[PDB]
Write a protein that binds this ligand. Structure first.
Ligand SMILES: [Mn+2]
Ligand code: NA
Ligand code: NA
Length: 92
């Protein structure tokens, strides 16, 4: 089965946040991302559909660098910072 869990490092200069967010909403069942400085979005996503790594590499091109992940959690958002999550938190 092709992977569903991917980490992606997305270049903001090549992919504005709103384009990334729309793609994540359309293609991810669950996702979260942070920002690290050229600013990059550091994404983890579980895709709705199994998708080959080669497909992911082609559709992101040099705008993002992706890799299937064996990690199965979004707990990086528990650290300090401003993160975007696909689900609703208590203060949202
Ligand atoms: Mn969604
Ligand atoms: Na958080
Ligand atoms: Na949230």
């Amino acid at each position: 089965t092709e992977p569903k869990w991917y980490d992606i490092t997305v270049s903001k200069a090549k992919c504005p946040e709103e384009i990334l967010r729309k793609w994540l909403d359309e293609n991810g069942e669950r996702y979260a991302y942070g920002r690290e400085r050229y600013e990059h979005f550091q994404v983890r996503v579980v895709l709705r559909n199994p998708t080959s790594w080669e497909t992911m590499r082609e559709i992101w091109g040099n705008s993002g660098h992706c890799s299937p992940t064996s990690i199965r959690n979004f707990d990086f958002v528990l650290k300090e910072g401003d993160f975007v999550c696909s689900w609703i938190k208590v203060p949202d």
